[PDB]
Amino acid sequence: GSSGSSGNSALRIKILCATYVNVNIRDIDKIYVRTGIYHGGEPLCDNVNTQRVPCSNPRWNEWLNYDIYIPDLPRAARLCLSICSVKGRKGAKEEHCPLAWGNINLFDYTDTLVSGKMALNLWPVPHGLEDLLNPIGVTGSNPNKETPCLELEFDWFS
């Protein structure tokens, strides 16, 4: 048997807020965040999106649940997030535009699921990034300050 540790099956991450967002103009209505996991650029399961918050207050403070399995999560796979801006017109549909993106290695350098709150900078999206989430984006915390940064909470209960 075993004392019983690191016995997680479902991954749950909570978002706090963002800083130095790419929201200059004052037309955007609200914003949202898209998270997901991919293995070598290829998707594994549906992605998750955070509630819609006003640019003025990118604060989320919501618990995001992932449809992934710890004991089924491949080392090659990882977590990828990206900020998007949604804005539409009366009667017309909304428009989503990518701003930044960040890839976090679900498995630390020691093949040990990450934990404890953390806040790293995100990389700027390419010229009008057709897509919203960049699963291919590089991993690590951008040393750049000007760039935005998102804070999340790593928790593993079950």
Swiss-Prot record:
C2 PI3K-type domain boundaries: 8-158
Linked pathology: PIK3CA mutations are involved in various type of cancer. Mutated isoforms participate in cellular transformation and tumorigenesis induced by oncogenic receptor tyrosine kinases (RTKs) and HRAS/KRAS. Interaction with HRAS/KRAS is required for Ras-driven tumor formation. Mutations increasing the lipid kinase activity are required for oncogenic signaling. The protein kinase activity may not be required for tumorigenesis. Colorectal cancer: A complex disease characterized by malignant lesions arising from the inner wall of the large intestine (the colon) and the rectum. Genetic alterations are often associated with progression from premalignant lesion (adenoma) to invasive adenocarcinoma. Risk factors for cancer of the colon and rectum include colon polyps, long-standing ulcerative colitis, and genetic family history.
Note: The avian sarcoma virus 16 genome encodes an oncogene derived from PIK3CA.
Record remark: domains: The PI3K-ABD domain and the PI3K-RBD domain interact with the PI3K/PI4K kinase domain. The C2 PI3K-type domain may facilitate the recruitment to the plasma membrane. The inhibitory interactions with PIK3R1 are mediated by the PI3K-ABD domain and the C2 PI3K-type domain with the iSH2 (inter-SH2) region of PIK3R1, and the C2 PI3K-type domain, the PI3K helical domain, and the PI3K/PI4K kinase domain with the nSH2 (N-terminal SH2) region of PIK3R1.
Protein role: Phosphoinositide-3-kinase (PI3K) phosphorylates phosphatidylinositol (PI) and its phosphorylated derivatives at position 3 of the inositol ring to produce 3-phosphoinositides. Uses ATP and PtdIns(4,5)P2 (phosphatidylinositol 4,5-bisphosphate) to generate phosphatidylinositol 3,4,5-trisphosphate (PIP3). PIP3 plays a key role by recruiting PH domain-containing proteins to the membrane, including AKT1 and PDPK1, activating signaling cascades involved in cell growth, survival, proliferation, motility and morphology. Participates in cellular signaling in response to various growth factors.
Quaternary structure note: Heterodimer of a catalytic subunit PIK3CA and a p85 regulatory subunit (PIK3R1, PIK3R2 or PIK3R3). Interacts with IRS1 in nuclear extracts. Interacts with RUFY3. Interacts with RASD2. Interacts with APPL1. Interacts with HRAS and KRAS. Interaction with HRAS/KRAS is required for PI3K pathway signaling and cell proliferation stimulated by EGF and FGF2. Interacts with FAM83B; activates the PI3K/AKT signaling cascade.
Similarity section: Belongs to the PI3/PI4-kinase family.
UniProt-recorded name of the protein: Phosphatidylinositol 4,5-bisphosphate 3-kinase catalytic subunit alpha isoform
Species of the source: Homo sapiens (Human)
Gene that this polypeptide is encoded by: PIK3CA
